[PDB]
Design a protein around this ligand. Structure first.
Ligand SMILES: NC(=O)c1ccc[n+]([C@@H]2O[C@H](COP(=O)([O-])OP(=O)(O)OC[C@H]3O[C@@H](n4cnc5c(N)ncnc54)[C@H](O)[C@@H]3O)[C@@H](O)[C@H]2O)c1
Ligand SMILES: NC(=O)c1ccc[n+]([C@@H]2O[C@H](COP(=O)([O-])OP(=O)(O)OC[C@H]3O[C@@H](n4cnc5c(N)ncnc54)[C@H](O)[C@@H]3O)[C@@H](O)[C@H]2O)c1
Lengths: 460, 460
């Protein structure tokens, strides 16, 4: 057993090894690609209304294993159990939502060509290779798999190596739903196996949810293979609070946005940018509220935070904290690794964070808030856009006109005005800059992996 | 002067050197990137109706230099002068079309979120680097530049090195129209210069129209730099004729589709796939019609074909003809380089072309038709899909239902039934497989380089 030969699951609350799974071999890869190719060949011929009904079947099979799934999520990566349950319910509802609204988004599109000669058809592309992360082991898979399969594609999952118990359980749910094994499939492939599949003609495109470094490594290969990719990568979302904000609501949303899933959220509020007049009141309220978050065993529902998922990533997070403190930030809360067998890092708040500091320029993928003072709203917008990332953003202010104007100038894919940032089937998700490109959910996730095909009759 | 240090224009009809231009230097690249960034910063703030009026100004300035532009196209790459005039007219009309229909396509999109709390906004992305080919030196630039700039982006053109006279004239047209500095720009960059620009933060995304080899080279770099790209690459379009086809119309469309622009068309009919019962009658009519095409001085309007654009590519095309004849195909017309100072290659027809031959597997980017016999309609579909390419396709048959079913199974981005394949502002354009990914024209070309942004108010 070694990370060079096996995927390994470890409980981050206890440090105990849970399972191992060897990398797929040459024959496993070939068999997966044959099954995927055969599955897509038949699935692409099915009726759209039949596929919608199969989505409802997926939702039912998932709910039927909802607690088994939630406990597996919590066990493998440390998520508080009620958050894992909420992840299951949101994933199941996504099946029903696309079942109801998806088919109409795939209807032929008329054009302005005379005599109704030309229409746009949304054709399936093929089998989509999907590379997914551990922070939402179910939702991240379902977010793409549901629309991708509804559009008549196949989906081939390469999951993160620390949640292969989750991966096998998801496959069992799709099996329970009667989804053919070619249509939803999966492989415990190492990175070289991923490389081989991208080069294989039976993979039509790639979708990646992960870090910036993974997106660049995989995106380069997809381009070299002339395969389209969607990259949903890291974020360092700004959370702007102006002097006229609803301060109580802003702090509630600020705390929820930073510390949900023990801070391990792509679109988490990570860089708090507070106008000078309200900064002292915001900072004091935010520290007190963050300090009231209980942390411990994620099977105990009194805990708002669990351990972080990966011991090496807690080390990396603490290193970023220490560098930021050494650069001149002030420690207001937390900021030390909990001793013991568990991978615990307490709610942490860093103040006097300047744009030159590590916690302002890197993704802080854990329960570490950075607080930066803005001279005014113009400064707050400049601070917000001064980032390699560009996934999402929040603005708190009672001047809705100003909020709308700032939203137009924020370099990110989502802007929440006076509310709680989240993903939702009804709206687009995805960012700009090093957060990547392409859009998921709504009709965007349905169309990203369609062959958009012009059919033009009698052009004479 | 050597192609190692300079871009060189040579008149293919005469062989005379027209112009030379050294590659852009480090200062030139930096200057262009600075002005692109500043131009985009101000351009993104303008009102959509102002930008629509500026598109009309581009169309006016282009029509004012229409004969000068047409003659420059013909002089640098050999296109018959009336096709160059048509290219200018189509490009000017594209400006007016997007001016009229573009703004509504950029309006905010309602969502299913209750109480109208969330909309989808189509924001500008930044400066788009555009890598373009010589076969339509004006239209390829305008096809993307017009919607890209209408959406509030900037456009930085890296044109093919044999048409830098066209590139400079295009820039003069944008100057005549009053397009602000850095909103439209261009550089005579060598391949390393392109690599540098892709890695530069002031390039937001890349669009490529060119060969499969260029798309793989550039696409890999875009992915590694986390830049979205659109790849519009080569084609080897099938042209299927079944026994019940309107034979006279099929032959007319077959000759027009193969030999327009002296065959140098991405979506040209390149692989003719004819059902056995009608193959002899098709082949004899096609040879006779192809033989009736006049070739010569492209400034003379009686000539349907000019010389090929590049002397090295004629050598390459003839090598493809020789290899295919060596593999067992039959030469029915043409098939030898014309003697003299001009780069002329006659209309050529190769028959008994089987799937294993060079003319069936590679893009024949010149006036060479390949004819393959299909046993039946299912064999024809299989033959059509047995290709690395997948740009467009044509089916001729009076059985509309069968044509619609084949269209759904053709692995390509466009299918023309009983008609002449062409690009048009009102429909999507783009392919699958090694022909690339992404879509141009209609609302697709407008949205490819937008930041699709959710704006959600009061999500509490
Ligand atoms: N934008 C989004 O939608 C979104 C959603 C969730 C998480 N994320 C991001 O995910 C990241 C954390 O999750 P992570 O730790 O699993 O990131 P990660 O990149 O290290 O791992 C992501 C996935 O990519 C695979 N992978 C990584 N490198 C690879 C390579 N060279 N070849 C093939 N496969 C490779 C991993 O095995 C894993 O399955 C954070 O940056 C977070 O912001 C983004
Ligand atoms: N799909 C489409 O919309 C479309 C339209 C027109 C032409 N084409 C294709 O264009 C091709 C012919 O034009 P071409 O001969 O100029 O193709 P080409 O690939 O040789 O050159 C295309 C462009 O890419 C640039 N380029 C090539 N390699 C590069 C590299 N490594 N780095 C940076 N830049 C590079 C060239 O300088 C040129 O500007 C044909 O294959 C044709 O089918 C496609």
């Amino acid at each position: 057993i070694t990370p060079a030969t096996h995927a390994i699951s470890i409980n981050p609350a206890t440090g105990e090894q849970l399972s191992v799974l060897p990398w797929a071999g040459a024959d496993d890869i070939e068999n997966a690609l044959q099954l995927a190719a055969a599955g897509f060949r038949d699935w692409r011929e099915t009726n759209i209304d039949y596929r919608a009904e199969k989505l409802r079947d997926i939702g039912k099979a998932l709910r039927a294993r909802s607690e088994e799934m939630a406990q597996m999520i919590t066990r493998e990566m440390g998520k508080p159990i009620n958050q894992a349950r909420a992840e299951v319910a949101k994933s199941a509802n996504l099946c029903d939502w696309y079942a109801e609204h998806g088919p109409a988004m795939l209807k032929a599109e008329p054009t302005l060509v005379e005599n109704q000669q030309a229409v746009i058809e949304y054709r399936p592309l093929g089998t989509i290779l999907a590379i997914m992360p551990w922070n939402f082991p179910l939702w991240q898979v379902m977010r793409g798999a549901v629309p991708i399969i509804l559009a008549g594609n196949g989906y081939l999952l390469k999951h993160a190596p620390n949640v292969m118990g989750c991966a096998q359980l998801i496959a069992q749910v799709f099996k329970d739903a009667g989804i053919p094994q070619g249509v939803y499939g999966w492989l415990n492939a190492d990175n070289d196996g991923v490389s081989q599949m991208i080069k294989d003609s039976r993979i039509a495109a790639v979708t990646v949810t992960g870090s910036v470094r993974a997106g660049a490594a995989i995106g380069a290969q997809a381009g070299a293979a002339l395969k389209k990719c969607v990259l949903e990568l890291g974020g360092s979302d700004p959370f702007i609070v102006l002097n006229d904000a609803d301060l109580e609501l802003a702090v509630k949303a600020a705390v929820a946005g930073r510390y949900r899933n023990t801070g391990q959220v792509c679109a988490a509020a990570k860089r708090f940018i507070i106008e000078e007049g309200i900064a002292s009141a915001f900072t004091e309220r935010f520290v007190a509220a963050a300090a009231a978050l209980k942390m411990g065993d994620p099977r105990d529902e009194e805990n708002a935070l669990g351990p972080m998922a990966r011991f090496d990533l807690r080390d990396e997070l603490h290193h970023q904290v220490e560098k930021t403190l050494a650069q001149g930030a002030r420690l207001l809360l937390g900021g030390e690794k909990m001793a013991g067998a568990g991978n615990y890092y307490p709610p942490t708040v860093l103040a006097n964070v300047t744009p030159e500091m590590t916690a302002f320029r890197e993704e802080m993928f854990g329960p570490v808030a950075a607080i930066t003072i803005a001279k005014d709203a113009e400064h707050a917008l400049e601070l917000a856009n001064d980032s390699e990332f560009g996934l999402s953003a929040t603005i708190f202010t009672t001047d809705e006109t100003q909020a709308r104007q700032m939203a137009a100038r924020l370099e990110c894919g989502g802007v929440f005005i006076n509310g709680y940032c989240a993903s939702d089937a009804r709206v687009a998700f995805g960012g700009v800059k090093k957060s990547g490109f392409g859009r998921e959910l709504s009709h965007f996730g349905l169309h990203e992996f369609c062959n958009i095909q012009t059919v033009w009759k009698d052009r004479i």
